[PDB]
Design a protein around this ligand. Structure first.
Ligand SMILES: [Ca+2]
Ligand SMILES: [Ca+2]
Ligand SMILES: [Ca+2]
Ligand SMILES: [Ca+2]
Length: 291
DNA sequence: GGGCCTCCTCACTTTCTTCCTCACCG
DNA sequence: CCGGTGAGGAAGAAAGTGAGGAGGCC
């Protein structure tokens, strides 16, 4: 079983709370409602999904294309397990806002209002604030209101951070040919990325870890944040000890382990030698996108 | 025994991850 | 010169979010 705070951190990273409201003339109200918690990952991390499944004793795992796998809970009885966990171990990103709307939608269905016109209206109102909001077909049918409270929580513990890092983390080794010379540049880099909507939370990492900085990235109108640590003494003294104690999950754990081997070589200045570089070069082949 | 629920196959957009380059300073 | 560091941006796919179909529960 996964540590429950590791689980929440991972959920804040890769989870999704979904409210479906579908047209159907076979329903008395004319709409069929479905409430879904979902985690979609690459097949290489199917084991995480299976362990969450056994930990919660709920949910179904299905394939999605040739390289992806998906764990979903939508059975109404089984959804109490989801709410139970996330009440006891609350999300801290803006996704918590989706969970609370998810939660309200559940209360509507629990008293069975989704089977009435008054409830469907309420559900549409809820869905409008969730994720990507109302469809065009749904906006047409329901011209009424277009926002939710901003979530402002701090990092609860390093077990959450471990779960969140197992999702959004990057353990990288940069190599490049120096402009003036024949030497190869070497940089160990740690990274956590997130949409700019959680700028406060991402800023909170500089304080919480006692190192690193934030870089603002964008493509046209799309923008995100990358928390990076490139100070090696910080990585060696602050970053690595954290995840040695608080174990990462999935393939990213393996990436971290190789990453630490590179960190050892760099600690002993062997990245400056010819043979140490090709050892590092060999490790890169084993890790990340190369795994 | 009609709605109603649940689980399947399946697909859209983008938020992540990964990778690359390089000027600067001490 | 040289190595360490931080800042930039490119590429694209592993994510996030959500689609229709339908068997069968109660
Ligand atoms: Ca995420
Ligand atoms: Ca991930
Ligand atoms: Ca992610
Ligand atoms: Ca690439």
């Amino acid at each position: 079983s996964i540590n429950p705070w590791i689980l929440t951190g991972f959920a804040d990273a890769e989870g999704s709370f979904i409210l479906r409201i579908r047209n159907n003339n076979g329903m008395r109200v004319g709409y069929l409602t479905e409430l879904i918690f979902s985690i979609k990952l690459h097949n290489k991390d199917k084991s995480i999904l299976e362990n969450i499944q056994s930990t919660w004793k709920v949910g179904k795992i299905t394939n999605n294309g040739d390289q992806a796998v998906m764990l979903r809970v939508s059975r109404f009885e089984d959804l109490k397990v989801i709410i139970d966990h996330f009440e006891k171990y609350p999300l801290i990103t803006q996704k918590l806002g989706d969970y609370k709307l998810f939660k309200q939608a559940y209360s509507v269905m629990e008293n069975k209002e989704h089977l009435k016109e008054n409830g469907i209206k309420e559900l549409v109102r809820i869905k409008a604030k969730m994720n990507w909001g109302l469809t065009d077909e749904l906006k047409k049918a329901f011209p009424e209101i277009i926002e939710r409270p901003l979530i402002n929580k701090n990092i609860p513990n390093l077990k959450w951070l471990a779960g969140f890092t197992s999702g959004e983390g990057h353990f990288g080794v940069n190599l490049w040919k120096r402009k003036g010379g024949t030497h190869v540049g070497v940089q160990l880099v740690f990274g956590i990325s997130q949409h700019i909507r959680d700028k406060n939370l991402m800023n909170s990492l500089i304080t919480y870890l006692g190192c690193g900085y934030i870089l603002e990235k964008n493509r046209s109108e799309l923008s995100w944040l990358d928390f990076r640590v490139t100070k090696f003494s910080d990585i060696n003294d602050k970053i690595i000890p954290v995840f040695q104690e608080n174990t990462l999950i999935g393939v990213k754990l393996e990436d971290f382990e190789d990453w630490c081997k590179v960190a050892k070589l760099i600690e002993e200045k062997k990245h400056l030698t010819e043979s140490g570089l090709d050892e590092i070069k060999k490790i890169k082949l084993n890790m990340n996108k190369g795994r």
